[PDB]
Amino acid sequence: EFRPEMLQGKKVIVTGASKGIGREMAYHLAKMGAHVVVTARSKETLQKVVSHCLELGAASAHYIAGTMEDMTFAEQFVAQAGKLMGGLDMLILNHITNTSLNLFHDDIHHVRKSMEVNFLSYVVLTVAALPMLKQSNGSIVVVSSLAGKVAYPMVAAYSASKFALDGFFSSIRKEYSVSRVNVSITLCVLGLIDTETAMKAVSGIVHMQAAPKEECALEIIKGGALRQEEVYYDSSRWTTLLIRNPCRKILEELYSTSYNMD
Amino acid sequence: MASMTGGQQMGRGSNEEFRPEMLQGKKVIVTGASKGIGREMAYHLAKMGAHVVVTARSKETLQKVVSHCLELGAASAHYIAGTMEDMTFAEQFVAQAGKLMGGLDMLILNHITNTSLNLFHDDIHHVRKSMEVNFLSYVVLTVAALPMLKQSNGSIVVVSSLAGKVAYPMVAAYSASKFALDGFFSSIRKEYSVSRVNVSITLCVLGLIDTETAMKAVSGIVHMQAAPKEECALEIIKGGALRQEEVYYDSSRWTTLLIRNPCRKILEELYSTSYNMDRF
Ligand SMILES: NC(=O)c1ccc[n+]([C@@H]2O[C@H](COP(=O)([O-])OP(=O)(O)OC[C@H]3O[C@@H](n4cnc5c(N)ncnc54)[C@H](OP(=O)(O)O)[C@@H]3O)[C@@H](O)[C@H]2O)c1
Ligand SMILES: NC(=O)c1ccc[n+]([C@@H]2O[C@H](COP(=O)([O-])OP(=O)(O)OC[C@H]3O[C@@H](n4cnc5c(N)ncnc54)[C@H](OP(=O)(O)O)[C@@H]3O)[C@@H](O)[C@H]2O)c1
Ligand SMILES: O=C(C[C@]1(Cc2ccccc2)[C@H]2C[C@H]3C[C@@H]1C[C@@H](C2)[C@@H]3O)N1CC(O)C1
Ligand SMILES: O=C(C[C@]1(Cc2ccccc2)[C@H]2C[C@H]3C[C@@H]1C[C@@H](C2)[C@@H]3O)N1CC(O)C1
Numbered sequence: 001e002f003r004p005e006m007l008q009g010k011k012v013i014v015t016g017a018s019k020g021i022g023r024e025m026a027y028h029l030a031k032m033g034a035h036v037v038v039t040a041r042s043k044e045t046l047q048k049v050v051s052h053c054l055e056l057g058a059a060s061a062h063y064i065a066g067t068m069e070d071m072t073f074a075e076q077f078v079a080q081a082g083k084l085m086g087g088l089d090m091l092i093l094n095h096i097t098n099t100s101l102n103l104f105h106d107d108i109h110h111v112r113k114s115m116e117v118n119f120l121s122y123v124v125l126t127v128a129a130l131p132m133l134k135q136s137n138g139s140i141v142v143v144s145s146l147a148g149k150v151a152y153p154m155v156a157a158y159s160a161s162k163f164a165l166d167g168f169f170s171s172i173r174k175e176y177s178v179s180r181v182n183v184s185i186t187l188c189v190l191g192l193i194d195t196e197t198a199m200k201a202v203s204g205i206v207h208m209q210a211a212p213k214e215e216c217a218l219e220i221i222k223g224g225a226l227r228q229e230e231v232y233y234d235s236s237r238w239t240t241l242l243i244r245n246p247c248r249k250i251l252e253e254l255y256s257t258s259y260n261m262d
Numbered sequence: 263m264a265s266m267t268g269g270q271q272m273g274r275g276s277n278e279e280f281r282p283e284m285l286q287g288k289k290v291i292v293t294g295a296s297k298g299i300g301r302e303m304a305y306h307l308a309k310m311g312a313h314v315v316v317t318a319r320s321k322e323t324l325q326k327v328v329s330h331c332l333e334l335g336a337a338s339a340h341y342i343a344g345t346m347e348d349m350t351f352a353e354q355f356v357a358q359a360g361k362l363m364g365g366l367d368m369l370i371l372n373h374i375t376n377t378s379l380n381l382f383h384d385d386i387h388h389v390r391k392s393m394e395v396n397f398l399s400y401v402v403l404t405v406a407a408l409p410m411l412k413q414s415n416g417s418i419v420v421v422s423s424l425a426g427k428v429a430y431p432m433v434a435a436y437s438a439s440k441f442a443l444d445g446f447f448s449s450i451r452k453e454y455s456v457s458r459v460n461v462s463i464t465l466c467v468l469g470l471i472d473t474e475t476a477m478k479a480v481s482g483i484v485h486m487q488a489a490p491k492e493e494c495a496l497e498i499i500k501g502g503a504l505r506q507e508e509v510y511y512d513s514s515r516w517t518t519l520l521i522r523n524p525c526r527k528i529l530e531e532l533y534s535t536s537y538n539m540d541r542f
Pocket of ligand 2: 472
């Protein structure tokens, strides 16, 4: 069971926290009395986020503006954010490259960029944060999607990147389990959220029910805090009922007895 | 006699039962076909009387697979050596292979970058390279082959793994890229379905196979049973010919029984009714 005091005085990194779910997570963490370091490209909206964080009761609030396309920036940001907070307890990986609904034809640049920003940078950020998280027995939060579990048209590049996250992060969870690395991996499977970017990108196309960004932000924090393997958050109650793969958990349990690292 | 001949090989029962004659005179591309499953697929296709174009880096090894193919009864056998790290090569290979066969009926995407069992630490170059060769090059190959496959109402075969459906330790980068294939290719299948593009997408979920590379990489680390490369190659070809969405091939009968996700098919069916696509 979750408690807001679980985040009181905790050192947290929030990527893609200029707007949407990221900003709401930073706001929730601020109220809980957590130390926060937010990142995105824009040096204006990150300044307006840090001030609203501080007003809500954050233990310390900071920003480091940059682009997650640059792997050197991602690696340097973690070392710098960790320097201001004197450690790290939670790494929230939320950022994505800008995406719109379109049928796939020949946009390889969008496929590559989607892999670089939505996946590759998450891996770079994890490598750079691992020593600090190992020290605090920290948590890694990976913000994914339903398109990261099931197939949907018009988001082919986006689905690839989100699917990779599942494959990469669930594999290293099984590695941390055997090598006794006390760093939890929380993968968040989200449906449509009422963010300004989402509402504009879905308008006219898919007009499904949109879940609130405020509650979405809280469930992600809850999931990470409790050290849950997976968090499911969507408006449809039929989703929650079918999204889980118990056969997958069984197969993984059956294959774990066939390996030797001894 | 081919100018006085004519008709269709896929009739009633073709949808459910495979025939070797389904590949007779078919134009097929086989990537990563210098050894392992790829070579066995090329060999099976040659016996069926198919036109084949094989690729991998090794100019020397590629030559041998071609010679044995023509001896097996292939309609025409060719090779184009090059690395799948170079996106320009991948794009140029398809145009050249299509030129040598006068079209394309099946695109078999089988190649992967060299990979070993190791816990993940800091090897970002292996993560990037795994995405570039195991996934991103498959997407380039697909873009370049799509016009020809649209012409013949062709098939795309994507060779994946169980580690592309469920999580396993020591193959994090490999598993990331085998998962990306599922996400990208299952999404475009749903796009081809609505836009009435008659090009099938066959994703192959394979367990341990007895290839020379696999046996060397898994010794003393993982002790599961390995399945034969010959039969594995045939089941992949079968699925492409039957236009099956997914092919599952493994030693454990408990795998086949649990690997399927019927809840996923149901959810996809439920979400398809919520989208508007009379645009793009
Ligand atoms: N919204 C939904 O319905 C929904 C559904 C499923 C999954 N999700 C997942 O939820 C997460 C957040 O989504 P959201 O809708 O809340 O986001 P959002 O409102 O679109 O915000 C995206 C954030 O990422 C930043 N960003 C964009 N390009 C960047 C780049 N190149 N480098 C670094 N940061 C970059 C943006 O700031 P700057 O432009 O200033 O850089 C912004 O802070 C994502 O991982 C998304 O996949 C959301
Ligand atoms: N064997 C198994 O247990 C198993 C299990 C599940 C899935 N699979 C999948 O089945 C497929 C075949 O596996 P396999 O074990 O048969 O492989 P294999 O014997 O290692 O053959 C790999 C092939 O890819 C080529 N290749 C490697 N790196 C390349 C590069 N950079 N550019 C272009 N071609 C390259 C190789 O030739 P060159 O080195 O000369 O280029 C060779 O033709 C792969 O997709 C694998 O993931 C296999
Ligand atoms: O993943 C998202 C929302 C999308 C992509 C999508 C995925 C599937 C269906 C429609 C759109 C992402 C990428 C992009 C478009 C959408 C809204 C934002 C997040 C962004 O603008 N969904 C909605 C599913 O229930 C899980
Ligand atoms: O996908 C493969 C085989 C592996 C990777 C692996 C995956 C899982 C467990 C052990 C190894 C790939 C990558 C690399 C090592 C293995 C053998 C070759 C293909 C290659 O040399 N499996 C075996 C599972 O049943 C699905």
